[PDB]
Chains A and B, each alone.
Chain A
Amino acid sequence: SSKYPRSVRRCLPLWALTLEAALILLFYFFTHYDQKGLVASYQVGQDLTVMAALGLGFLTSNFRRHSWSSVAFNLFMLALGVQWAILLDGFLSQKVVITLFSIRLATMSAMSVLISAGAVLGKVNLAQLVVMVLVEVTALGTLRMVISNIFNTDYHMNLRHFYVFAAYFGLTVAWCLPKPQRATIPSLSAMLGALFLWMFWPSVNSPLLRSPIQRKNAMFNTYYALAVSVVTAISGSSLAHPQRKISMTYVHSAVLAGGVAVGTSCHLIPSPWLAMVLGLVAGLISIGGAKCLPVCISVMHSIFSLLGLLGEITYIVLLVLHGFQVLLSIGELSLAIVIALTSGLLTGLLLNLKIWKAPHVAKYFDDQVFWKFPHLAVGF
């Protein structure tokens, strides 16, 4: 068919404006507003916002000619996802009261979509990303509600499964897409994004913790685990590379290894040495994943999926120390994986519809498909 992109001058504006108008109407009909630590509480959500917009936004900008789309589409996805997550977390956990904690939780839900979208970025347009944002936020909320109903946990505390849900959802959606690279300056911008994610990831591991000592220990463990991982990553990148050089792309994903590994168990680890051991093991598994997974589409999302599974497994191991609960937690993990896979499949078949005017497979990873550039022939 025609490899020249179809005009979205009627699809994209109507779709986005309708979405925003519906969000405004729902906020009118269902949301309501209403101290000492106002700034302290605002700081955590602000850290999550920096990690979403800047960290994940630039982490996927490493593409030679898709950096514009990566950054701007991540911004758009965050803006849509926070509003929709506010409404949906209101609907599935009760009128919706807008506090800073609810905005923080909506930001976490949006970050799930932002992590998933790295597996599909460069192969989709903005409308498909809108569909992905909506369906993925809905699926994560449904998963949390199902867990809260079955295992009698809090709906908000079920958001700890977000690493593995995002990883497997993105893997499934990328698997459903039609089948098909770096530059120095985009790689440096991606290093900026990766550094911001790595410096603020202790905020990802303790937004849902109320007790101050729990948050303290979680941030301690995340900080030390992330420190060991950076060393294992930059050091072991050479082993897991055919020409024995350090890979910038591998480093960008692998620095977050310890943070992902201790994410679900940071508040439970009692001493920094155990967090450091977990960070080292996560770095070694990242090296092995880089060396092995391409043999058996995105390798970084595959190793992130492995790391999230490892984090849940080490949570299972550590929770026993602090056998029915083992079965219950294995069941929670398997339900999370099953729902992530099924919802990713549904999203993938939705994204394959002709109505979205997806880019031709020859036109992947290219900003000229979506953006205006000068001195180009336009139209027919």
Chain B
Amino acid sequence: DAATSFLRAARSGNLDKALDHLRNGVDINTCNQNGLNGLHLASKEGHVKMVVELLHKEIILETTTKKGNTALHIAALAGQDEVVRELVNYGANVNAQSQKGFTPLYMAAQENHLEVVKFLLENGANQNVATEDGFTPLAVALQQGHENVVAHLINYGTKGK
């Protein structure tokens, strides 16, 4: 009940209720049946203040879900530019790979999130990391028609971090 209420508050962005559960003793690393903790749920919904507050209370930043997605993966797939920036500012691994081999750059590129793609490239995301299918962020954006993303990935090339 307490952990479920905390996760619901994290998903809804109710920072005050979530801060109360942690005072009362709800472990910050609790996750739902899908392996998503409070940081994942806040990153999905763009709740930057909740993300910052949870990072301050020592949540594990590189905790993966049952699909192997980190909080940066979820923020990139959801296109939350400010949450992506905040996660990277606190030391999120931009080159993390999920179970199927997806990187945050791949999730941002397949979803036509140009700002997230540009930010992840400027932070040293290696666009040569392929999935288990052999697909790159460039290859998925070509298939999905994401031309603004295809341009930025080719024009950046390897400016690195």
Chains A, B in direct contact (C-beta < 8 Å): yes
Q: Does A373 contact B (CB under 8 A)?
A: yes
Tell me the dominant secondary structure on chain A's binding face.
loop
Please name 9 further chain A to chain B contacts, defined as beta carbons within 8 Å, in addition to the given A4-B77, A4-B111, A375-B110, sorted by A numbering: A2-B44, A2-B80, A65-B145, A366-B112, A373-B144, A375-B139, A377-B110, A379-B67, A380-B69
What total of A-B pairs shows CB separation below 8 Å? 58
Q: Does A330 contact B (CB under 8 A)?
A: no
Give A354 Cβ to nearest chain B Cβ, in Å: 13
Task: Tell which of B36, B46, B102, B143 touches A377, judged by Cβ atoms closer than 8 Å.
Answer: B102
Q: Does B121 contact A (CB under 8 A)?
A: no
Question: In the complex, are the beta carbons of B34 and A380 less than 8 A apart?
Answer: yes
Query: Once the chains are docked, how many angstroms separate the CA of A373 from the CA of B139?
Result: 13
Query: Once the chains are docked, how many angstroms separate the CA of A34 from the CA of B133?
Result: 58
Question: In the complex, are the beta carbons of A380 and B143 less than 8 A apart?
Answer: no
A residues 148-169 in Cβ contact with B at 8 Å: none
B residues 114-132 in Cβ contact with A at 8 Å: 131
Q: Does B63 contact A (CB under 8 A)?
A: no
Given contacts A3-B113, A380-B67, contact A375 B77 (CB under 8 A): no
Query: Once the chains are docked, how many angstroms separate the CA of A374 from the CA of B135?
Result: 10
Count, chain B residues at interface, CB 8 A? 32
Give A240 Cβ to nearest chain B Cβ, in Å: 27
Q: Does A376 contact B (CB under 8 A)?
A: yes
Closest 6 CB pairs of A and B: A3-B79, A2-B78, A377-B102, A375-B135, A4-B78, A65-B145
Question: In the complex, are the beta carbons of A1 and B46 less than 8 A apart?
Answer: yes
Query: Once the chains are docked, how many angstroms separate the CA of A366 from the CA of B146?
Result: 10
Question: In the complex, are the beta carbons of A376 and B110 less than 8 A apart?
Answer: yes
Query: Once the chains are docked, how many angstroms separate the CA of A379 from the CA of B107?
Result: 11
Given contacts A4-B79, A65-B145, A373-B144, contact A380 B110 (CB under 8 A): no
Q: Does B59 contact A (CB under 8 A)?
A: no
Contacts of A329 in B (CB 8 A): none
Query: Once the chains are docked, how many angstroms separate the CA of A2 from the CA of B112?
Result: 14
Q: Does B100 contact A (CB under 8 A)?
A: yes
Give A197 Cβ to nearest chain B Cβ, in Å: 27
Given contacts A1-B45, A375-B131, A375-B133, contact A380 B77 (CB under 8 A): yes
Contact with B along A364-379 (1 / 0, CB 8 A): 0010100001111101
Question: In the complex, are the beta carbons of B67 and A375 less than 8 A apart?
Answer: no
Interface positions of A (Cβ within 8 A of B): 1-4, 64-65, 362, 366, 368, 373-377, 379-380
27 pairs, A vs B, C-beta closer than 8 Å: A1-B46, A2-B46, A2-B78, A3-B78, A3-B80, A4-B77, A362-B79, A373-B144, A374-B143, A375-B110, A375-B133, A375-B139, A375-B143, A376-B110, A376-B140, A377-B73, A377-B77, A377-B100, A377-B106, A377-B110, A379-B67, A380-B34, A380-B36, A380-B44, A380-B65, A380-B67, A380-B77
Contacts of A368 in B (CB 8 A): 110-111, 144
Query: Once the chains are docked, how many angstroms separate the CA of A373 from the CA of B110?
Result: 10
Give A9 Cβ to nearest chain B Cβ, in Å: 14
Contacts of B95 in A (CB 8 A): none
Contact with A along B86-116 (1 / 0, CB 8 A): 0000000000001010100011001111000
Interface centre among A3, A373, A380 (most CB of B within 10 A): A380
Give A362 Cβ to nearest chain B Cβ, in Å: 7
Of all chain B residues, the one with the shortest Cβ separation from A369 is B111
Contacts of B74 in A (CB 8 A): 380
Contacts of B69 in A (CB 8 A): 380
Query: Once the chains are docked, how many angstroms separate the CA of A380 from the CA of B33?
Result: 12
Contacts of A65 in B (CB 8 A): 144-145
Of all chain A residues, the one with the shortest Cβ separation from B136 is A375
Contacts of A376 in B (CB 8 A): 110, 140, 144
Contacts of B98 in A (CB 8 A): 377
Of all chain A residues, the one with the shortest Cβ separation from B134 is A375
Question: In the complex, are the beta carbons of B133 and A64 less than 8 A apart?
Answer: no
Contact with A along B33-77 (1 / 0, CB 8 A): 010100010001110000000000000000001010100011001
Task: Tell which of A2, A4, A64 touches B145, judged by Cβ atoms closer than 8 Å.
Answer: A64
Query: Once the chains are docked, how many angstroms separate the CA of A362 from the CA of B34?
Result: 27
Of all chain A residues, the one with the shortest Cβ separation from B116 is A3
Query: Once the chains are docked, how many angstroms separate the CA of A375 from the CA of B130?
Result: 11
Question: In the complex, are the beta carbons of A373 and B40 less than 8 A apart?
Answer: no
Query: Once the chains are docked, how many angstroms separate the CA of A379 from the CA of B145?
Result: 21
Query: Once the chains are docked, how many angstroms separate the CA of A158 from the CA of B45?
Result: 49
Query: Once the chains are docked, how many angstroms separate the CA of A366 from the CA of B45?
Result: 21
